[PDB]
Amino acid sequence: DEIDAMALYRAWQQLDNGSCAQIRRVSEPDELRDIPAFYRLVQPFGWENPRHQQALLRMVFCLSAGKNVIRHQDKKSEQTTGISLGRALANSGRINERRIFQLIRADRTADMVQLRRLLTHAEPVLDWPLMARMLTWWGKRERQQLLEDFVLTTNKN
Amino acid sequence: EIDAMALYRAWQQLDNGSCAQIRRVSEPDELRDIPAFYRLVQPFGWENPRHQQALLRMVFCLSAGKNVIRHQDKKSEQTTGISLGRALANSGRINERRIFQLIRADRTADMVQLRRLLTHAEPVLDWPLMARMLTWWGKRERQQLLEDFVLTTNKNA
Amino acid sequence: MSNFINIHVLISHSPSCLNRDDMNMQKDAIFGGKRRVRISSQSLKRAMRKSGYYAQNIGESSLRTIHLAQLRDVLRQKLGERFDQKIIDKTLALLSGKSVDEAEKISADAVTPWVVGEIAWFCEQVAKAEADNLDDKKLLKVLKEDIAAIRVNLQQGVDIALSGRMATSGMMTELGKVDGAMSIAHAITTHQVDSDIDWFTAVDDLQEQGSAHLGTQEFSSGVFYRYANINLAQLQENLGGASREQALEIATHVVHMLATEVPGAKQRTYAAFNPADMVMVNFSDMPLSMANAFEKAVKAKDGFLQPSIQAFNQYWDRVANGYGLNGAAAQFSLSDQVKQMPTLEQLKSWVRNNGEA
Amino acid sequence: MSNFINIHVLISHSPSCLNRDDMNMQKDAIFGGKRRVRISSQSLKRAMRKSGYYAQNIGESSLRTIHLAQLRDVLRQKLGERFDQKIIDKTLALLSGKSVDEAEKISADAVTPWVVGEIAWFCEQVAKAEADNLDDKKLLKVLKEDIAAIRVNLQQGVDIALSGRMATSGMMTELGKVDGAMSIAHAITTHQVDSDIDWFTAVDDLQEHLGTQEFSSGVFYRYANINLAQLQENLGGASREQALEIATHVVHMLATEVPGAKQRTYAAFNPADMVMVNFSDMPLSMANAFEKAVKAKDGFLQPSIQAFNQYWDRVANGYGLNGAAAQFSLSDVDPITAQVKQMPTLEQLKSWVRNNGEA
Amino acid sequence: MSNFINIHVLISHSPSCLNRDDMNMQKDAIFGGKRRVRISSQSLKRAMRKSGYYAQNIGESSLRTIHLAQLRDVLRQKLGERFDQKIIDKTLALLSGKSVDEAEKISADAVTPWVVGEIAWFCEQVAKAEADNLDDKKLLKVLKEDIAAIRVNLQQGVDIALSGRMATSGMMTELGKVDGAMSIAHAITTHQVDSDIDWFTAVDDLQEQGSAHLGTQEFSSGVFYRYANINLAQLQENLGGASREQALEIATHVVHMLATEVPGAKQRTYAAFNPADMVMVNFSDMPLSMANAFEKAVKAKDGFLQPSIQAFNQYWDRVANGYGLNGAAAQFSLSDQVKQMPTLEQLKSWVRNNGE
RNA sequence: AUAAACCGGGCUCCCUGUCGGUUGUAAUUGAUAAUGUUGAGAGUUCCCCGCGCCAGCGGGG
């Protein structure tokens, strides 16, 4: 029912350099639909179910920042979730607050483009399945929560 | 809407002279320069300008030959029949890059290339579904063609 | 005759930042559920007030301040040839409600508008009152008699005649209440705007800077809808009972300025000196804005300008028919019952002539 | 006489990356709902400021910094033969509002433009004020009385006279506040641009990993104007003709100078294909000629120039612009109607500008 | 005297694939709203640097790498007859900022250019410091006083003198910062190109026929515009203060190479060994490219070449008359105030003689 | 025609001034799209008019 995020992650990690190269050339999420290698990548992960397509398009798009741009790290046994996207972006020390500002205010499509730029720039360390859920919904609530996590992190750290 | 199987049956029973005369075009609009065309497509609402573009495409593909496109009805189990992309993939005669360069090919470049693929592959398919695809023929129907092709090729291997 | 005059402007700006807030981000507003970029009314006002067109066709502008010491010295300087120093000081005191020492720091209650002409007139009055050893509250009593005589002075302070003034202290509290004759709306864009950001640096000519964090400046371009109306009667009153012709004159200047003046912010580094591409003027018995023409935000097609102009025109047709608005209207446009005007000057003339030339 | 001089430039660049941000991305901007490529006004300014042409026809650039230690040392070396070190140190300390020790690092509030001529002048004043046991406050109030006398020194810092200066510390707050005479806009393309991407590598000569760079070509619209009166004022009261000469050099530089970025690898050393100069009472930009992004036909250049010419026709007729105007262009096709004098060469244009638009 | 030399080349290649990206697609660019085939400036620079002509006429080229271990071995073997091993290893360690063990793999921060002569000179310096118990710090500050004496070594690394060097570590970070003297553009076709696709197979000699699926390779022909300019003053400075004549010499060699050298890519399969059909050189006080001659993409008539040349000539006339370019200019061409040259050698001589 | 009815929270206000994101970088080496094939047959060609020995001939679309 729910999309496997970790599977897709590892899949993207072990992808052949040519396919990765072919996917890395999209400049917009929907362009992934122009690319054979993409469908081959997401076929095992429920692409054929319309419910999961938009979601998958985002996931891959962000991953398409690089083969190891998004470093996944498991959460600690103690805490209930791992590192959030905002927090990681803030932790990188390379992302300026106004970037997030203009991100959460961006139109559809544009936001994902911007996000991917931020990911290449930061090479964040985060709980990937968490980010994946976030991308799965990606609405007002989530954008806001992103900026909040960023702000509070940058505040303490 | 436009009756498909009617147009197909008309094409199957057209006289060989008209048939060969139609095949000879090299671009859909050239069909407008041919009488046999008008007599063929008039019973199916050519007179309504909304339906014209569509018809021009459909016939063009049919113009590959009187028996290049083999219709086959969908099985009662299945909700839809064999789409074009699946058919092409099933042929074993088409190369992925032909399809890729097909969906990235400009109005017009596009139909010519498709007809070449049709003659080459002589596909068995649910014709009215193809007809619908040709009725709309926009970014997502093209992308869907590529999807079906790639995914079928991966499935079958 | 119609009391109200409506001025609509569609003007398109190249990338720029014509107004910002406490975080130096472009001022915005939500309309139709989508973000428009906004140029506030006060900004437009001050733009027109301090313009050179104003200075050459309308006259002197009010002087808004809170530093009665500085104002003291200024007033001494430009009135010293007509009045005694303490006649001046006295007048200042009576109007401000604060004692005019030779202190170098004297604070009013708030930043208020000072028309110099007005103050000169009050200086004549206070001179009189000084000659007859008259008590202040009685001078007040006398002056409350004929307020029009004081408003006649706002012809050397038209900007207050247009935008009004509220009074809180001194005799102004009784004599100074002006209700503005011009209503003016915050400029907003006819389309959704996602603002761009400039990321700049400063190269230090004495050290090869390496890693650095770049400064940010929000900016955007946009097609703005400006709207203002003028209440002719109230202008006439605010000016001391001036003729309709003088009102219409001032109105025409407001049209010009609303069609040409652009706030000054960051213009030295973004240069958005664009004239307006559409100006329509419309006489009416009840003021009405055309903002709702762009509530459904304009989607671009070959730009935002033309689609905006057409949105405008269509809503104008629908409202004119719907509410039966037969009033003189004229439209000036750069692009190929409303009288069309080839040049801005023809429009201006039309307005001067009460809308029938 | 007209107070404002407007400079419009259409200049076409071959594949390049002339301005980028902290993420190696081309600077862009949205106009008419389509993406233009952008070159920031700062970039143009500093490219002009530091150019060779400026060095040969205007003079020495202002020295912009925030490091008062280094500045101290510099000022010593270039002025030492004229003043005691302690007069220099004191002048710097008074202007900056910080204390000039023999401290290794002494930082101002911000990167400020300094002119050595100006600092010298202040050194004289501080010296006579030293000889008269006059106190710093009174010195300040005295100097505040004749500002022009300080603005004359900006003839050795003309760029400041053009782009201005702000101060937040020291006597400069009262004295060194300069209001820029030249307004200049970001350069944007007249058309939509979808940037290309160069995928590159580096070959290791001792063994047997791809990077990326964004680039694009584009037809750019440069705009600037100069406020003659404010220039004259900012130069101490200089003549209208000296003003016009400086404005002329700005025309030249805006039509020929190009930011240095990525140029050694992309070489977009192109000159302008159209330059129009136009005299005016109220400054106006022609950017709106390209609000409707220019569609290509036989290039972007010709249709951009025609679009320009048309808008200028519409705006000039519509707003009744009677002002001296002249246009230099490398193209042959139909220009602006006869109130716009045509110039075969750039130098004829510049002469026409030097001559208040009558030659 | 004029400080800039502008080199313009029009060169027509036959079906080939002279530069491609990580998907083996031809490199392109959009100019004038149309697609042009492109050859990167790095491709051109490296082709020139590694060419035979450069080895015979200019000499040693830099050794760019990131493997300090391997470089250590190479440097030992190449300098071992002038310095003993420890001086070398120490010098390398100083210039790179890494410790030079006897380790198998010693990485620099990035691939950088190394000039062997330069390194040697540093070895002599380090050695003098060795005999005089001079601290490394003091050594550095001694070296920063006379930089030109370091730059005089770039006559055995002229490619660095032309295309610059950036250092981010070791003493090089203060000493190796080199400002390139040659600016060079990407080559772009003067006309639109829609690339062709070669569909190929690989026949198995032991497999009895059968339908295989075919590979693809993008290719195309095209008339390319090449541009570069040389900042003479900067070349002189970069070589330690060499005369103008040595600089005009180097510039001449660059004219030759830019007119004749073609990148080696896919040439064993496509062989586009074509020589330029036009070469013009132009002396100037401000660098200027002529790419805008082809902004309006060149329409074919009797090929792309002649219209391309014509376009070039007209736009040069316009630019010259409009911007008043009093400057030495000369043009060589294989077809029938700009001095014509019948042969490239005469153009080269005209350049060597400062255009007189 | 209800703790209701009657019943404005209302007047005034630039967020302004200063700022190159800059230096360096081959995508490169290998590769048949190949085997097999009459376009044969067949006077229909839709309308008007003239002539005719009603076999057809001719003029105009």
Q: At what angle do helices B127-136 and B139-156 cross, to 10 degrees?
A: 140
3-state secondary structure of C40: coil
Residue E18 exposed, middle or buried by CB count within 10 Å (0-12, 13-18, 19+)? buried
**What positions of strand F are covered by protein, i.e. any atom < 7 Å from a CB?**
11-35, 39, 45
Q: Are E352 and E252 in contact (CB under 8 A)?
A: yes
Give whole-number Cα distances, C118 to C123, C156, C170, E52, E115, in Å: 8, 8, 14, 90, 82
- d(Cα D159, Cα E19) in Å, to the nearest integer? 44
Q: Tell me which of A34, A38, A53, A54 to substitute to probe the interface with B (most B C-beta atoms closer than 10 Å).
A: A34
CATH topology of domain B1-157: Peroxidase; domain 1 (1.10.520)
- Closest residue on chain A to D210 (Cα): A21
Residue closest to C73 by CA, chosen among C96, C104, C98 = C104
Q: Are E75 and E83 in contact (CB under 8 A)?
A: no
3-state secondary structure of E109: strand
Q: Are B105 and B142 in contact (CB under 8 A)?
A: no
* Documented resolution in Å: 3.0
Q: At what angle do helices C344-352 and C244-260 cross, to 10 degrees?
A: 160
Q: Shortest CA–C1' contact from E265: which nucleotide?
A: F28
Judge if the beta carbon of C170 is closer than 7 A to nucleic acid strand F. no
Q: Are E130 and E83 in contact (CB under 8 A)?
A: no
Give whole-number Cα distances, B103 to B114, B138, D245, E216, in Å: 9, 10, 59, 17
Phi, psi of D5 (to 5 degrees): -120, 120
Report which of residues 52-91 in chain C place their beta carbon less than 7 angstroms from any atom of strand F.
Answer: 64
Give whole-number Cα distances, E130 to B75, D254, E121, E126, in Å: 90, 55, 14, 6
Non-local CB neighbours of D56 within 8 Å, separated by 6+ positions: none
DSSP E strand stretches across chain A: 71-72, 125-126
Non-local CB neighbours of E176 within 8 Å, separated by 6+ positions: E95, E165, E166, E167
- Through-space separation of residue D52 CA and nucleotide F30 C1' in angstroms: 52
- d(Cα C7, Cα C232) in Å, to the nearest integer? 13
Q: How far is C7 from chain D (nearest CA, A)?
A: 17
Question: E292: left (phi > 0), else alpha (psi -120 to 50), else beta?
Answer: alpha
Q: Are B84 and B123 in contact (CB under 8 A)?
A: yes
Q: At what angle do helices D240-256 and D346-354 cross, to 10 degrees?
A: 160
- Closest residue on chain C to A103 (Cα): C194
Q: Within an 8 Å CB–CB cutoff, is residue D29 touching chain E?
A: no
Question: E165: left (phi > 0), else alpha (psi -120 to 50), else beta?
Answer: beta
CA closest to C1' of F24 belongs to E166
Residue closest to D270 by CA, chosen among D9, D53, D13 = D13
Question: C34: left (phi > 0), else alpha (psi -120 to 50), else beta?
Answer: beta
Q: Tell me which of A17, A25, A34, A67 to substitute to probe the interface with E (most E C-beta atoms closer than 10 Å).
A: A25
Q: Are A62 and A103 in contact (CB under 8 A)?
A: no
Angle in degrees, CA C333, C339, C342, rounded to 5: 40
Written as six digits, the tokens of C305 are 């300008």
Residue C207 exposed, middle or buried by CB count within 10 Å (0-12, 13-18, 19+)? exposed
- Domain limits, chain B: 1-157
- d(Cα C294, Cα C299) in Å, to the nearest integer? 10
DSSP β-ladder status, D325-329 and D341-343: parallel
Show residues of chain B in contact with A43, CB under 8 Å.
151, 154
Residue closest to E51 by CA, chosen among E10, E43, E17 = E43
Written as six digits, the tokens of E130 are 């060795």
- d(Cα C318, Cα D290) in Å, to the nearest integer? 31
Which amino acid, residue D282? M
Residue closest to C252 by CA, chosen among C190, C330, C189 = C330
Non-local CB neighbours of D257 within 8 Å, separated by 6+ positions: D44, D47, D48, D51, D53
Residue closest to C125 by CA, chosen among C109, C102, C145 = C145
Which amino acid, residue C137? K
Q: How far is A120 from chain B (nearest CA, A)?
A: 28
- d(Cα E85, Cα E77) in Å, to the nearest integer? 9
Report which of residues 102-131 in chain D place their beta carbon less than 7 angstroms from any atom of strand F.
Answer: 110-113
Written as six digits, the tokens of B144 are 């869907």
Non-local CB neighbours of D233 within 8 Å, separated by 6+ positions: D148, D151
User: Cα D125 vs. chain centroid, distance in angstroms?
Assistant: 31
- Through-space separation of residue B15 CA and nucleotide F44 C1' in angstroms: 14
Residue closest to E163 by CA, chosen among E282, E249, E44 = E44
Residue closest to D122 by CA, chosen among D102, D98, D96 = D96
B:84-123 residues touching chain E, CB 8 A cutoff: 92-93, 95, 97, 101
Q: Shortest CA–C1' contact from C27: which nucleotide?
A: F15
Written as six digits, the tokens of A40 are 């081959």
**Cα first-last separation, chain C:** 15
- d(Cα B29, Cα E350) in Å, to the nearest integer? 59
SS3 for A23-61 is HCCCCCHHHHHHCHHHHHHHHHHCCCCHHHHHHHHHHHH
User: Cα A114 vs. chain centroid, distance in angstroms?
Assistant: 11
Give whole-number Cα distances, B44 to B51, B61, B71, B125, in Å: 9, 16, 19, 21
Q: Tell me which of C9, C12, C14 to substitute to probe the interface with D (most D C-beta atoms closer than 10 Å).
A: C14
Task: Name the CA dihedral angle for C176, C180, C185, C186, rounded to a multiple of 10 degrees.
Answer: -20
Q: Are E107 and E68 in contact (CB under 8 A)?
A: yes
CA closest to C1' of F42 belongs to B17
Beta bridge partners of D8: D223, D276
CA closest to C1' of F11 belongs to C166
- d(Cα D115, Cα D74) in Å, to the nearest integer? 12
User: Cα A36 vs. chain centroid, distance in angstroms?
Assistant: 21
Q: Are C30 and C295 in contact (CB under 8 A)?
A: no
Written as six digits, the tokens of C143 are 């002056």
Phi, psi of D74 (to 5 degrees): -55, -50
Written as six digits, the tokens of D279 are 């005299």
DSSP β-ladder status, B124-125 and B70-71: parallel
Give whole-number Cα distances, D252 to D219, D228, D276, E196, in Å: 18, 17, 11, 45
3-state secondary structure of B98: helix
SS3 for chain D is CCCEEEEEEEEEEEEECCCECCCCCECEEEECCEEEEEECHHHHHHHHHHCHHHHHHCCCCCEEEEEHHHHHHHHHHHHCCCCCHHHHHHHHHHHHCCCCCCCCCCEEEEEEEECHHHHHHHHHHHHHHHHCCCCHHHHHHHHCCCCHHHHHHHHHCHHHHHHCECCCCCCHHHHCCECCCEEECCEEECCCCCCEEEEECCCCCCCCCCEEEEEEEEEEEEEEEEEHHHHHHHCCCCCHHHHHHHHHHHHHHHHHCCCCCCHHHHCCCCCCCEEEEEEECCCCCCHHHHCCCCCCCCCCHHHHHHHHHHHHHHHHHHHCCCCCEEEEECCCCCCCCCCCEEECCHHHHHHHHHCCCCC
User: Cα C285 vs. chain centroid, distance in angstroms?
Assistant: 22
Residue D52 exposed, middle or buried by CB count within 10 Å (0-12, 13-18, 19+)? exposed
- d(Cα E334, Cα E32) in Å, to the nearest integer? 28
Show residues of chain A in contact with C197, CB under 8 Å.
98, 102
Non-local CB neighbours of C320 within 8 Å, separated by 6+ positions: C337
Which amino acid, residue D178? V
- d(Cα D146, Cα D156) in Å, to the nearest integer? 19
Task: Name the CA dihedral angle for A140, A141, A144, A150, rounded to a multiple of 10 degrees.
Answer: -140
3-state secondary structure of E198: strand
Within 13 Å of residue E165, how many CA atoms lie on the same side as its CB? 28
Instruction: For residue B29, give the DSSP letter.
Output: G
Non-local CB neighbours of E207 within 8 Å, separated by 6+ positions: none
- d(Cα D85, Cα D78) in Å, to the nearest integer? 11
Written as six digits, the tokens of E190 are 């003067």
Show residues of chain B in contact with E213, CB under 8 Å.
95
- Closest residue on chain D to C192 (Cα): D33
Q: Which single residue is written with the structure tokens 């630019």?
A: E319
Residue A28 exposed, middle or buried by CB count within 10 Å (0-12, 13-18, 19+)? middle
Q: Shortest CA–C1' contact from E263: which nucleotide?
A: F26
Q: Are E340 and E330 in contact (CB under 8 A)?
A: yes
**How large is the greatest C-alpha to C-alpha distance in chain C, in angstroms?**
77
- Domain limits, chain C: 1-357
Q: How far is A20 from chain B (nearest CA, A)?
A: 16
DSSP E strand stretches across chain E: 4-16, 28-31, 34-39, 63-67, 107-114, 182-184, 187-189, 196-200, 215-231, 278-284, 329-333, 339-341
Q: Shortest CA–C1' contact from E214: which nucleotide?
A: F33
Residue D327 exposed, middle or buried by CB count within 10 Å (0-12, 13-18, 19+)? buried
Chains E and B touch (3+ CB pairs under 8 A): yes
The stretches of E2-151 forming alpha helices (DSSP H) are: 41-49, 52-57, 68-79, 85-96, 116-131, 136-143, 148-151
Taking the CA atoms of C14, C18, C23 and C25 in sequence, report the sign of the dihedral they define.
negative
- d(Cα D163, Cα D45) in Å, to the nearest integer? 8
Within 13 Å of residue D59, how many CA atoms lie on the same side as its CB? 15
Nearest neighbour of A39 by CB, restricted to B103, B140, B147: B147
D:149-208 residues touching chain E, CB 8 A cutoff: 191, 194, 196, 198-200, 202-207
Q: How far is E46 from chain A (nearest CA, A)?
A: 25
Nearest neighbour of C206 by CB, restricted to D71, D285, D317: D71
Instruction: For residue B31, give the DSSP letter.
Output: G
Instruction: For residue A95, give the DSSP letter.
Output: -
- d(Cα E44, Cα E185) in Å, to the nearest integer? 9
Chains D and E touch (3+ CB pairs under 8 A): yes
Non-local CB neighbours of D334 within 8 Å, separated by 6+ positions: D306, D309
Residue closest to B137 by CA, chosen among B117, B98, B97, B110 = B110
Q: Are D215 and D266 in contact (CB under 8 A)?
A: yes
- d(Cα C34, Cα E33) in Å, to the nearest integer? 33
Angle in degrees, CA C184, C187, C193, rounded to 5: 165
Instruction: For residue C22, give the DSSP letter.
Output: T
CA closest to C1' of F15 belongs to C21
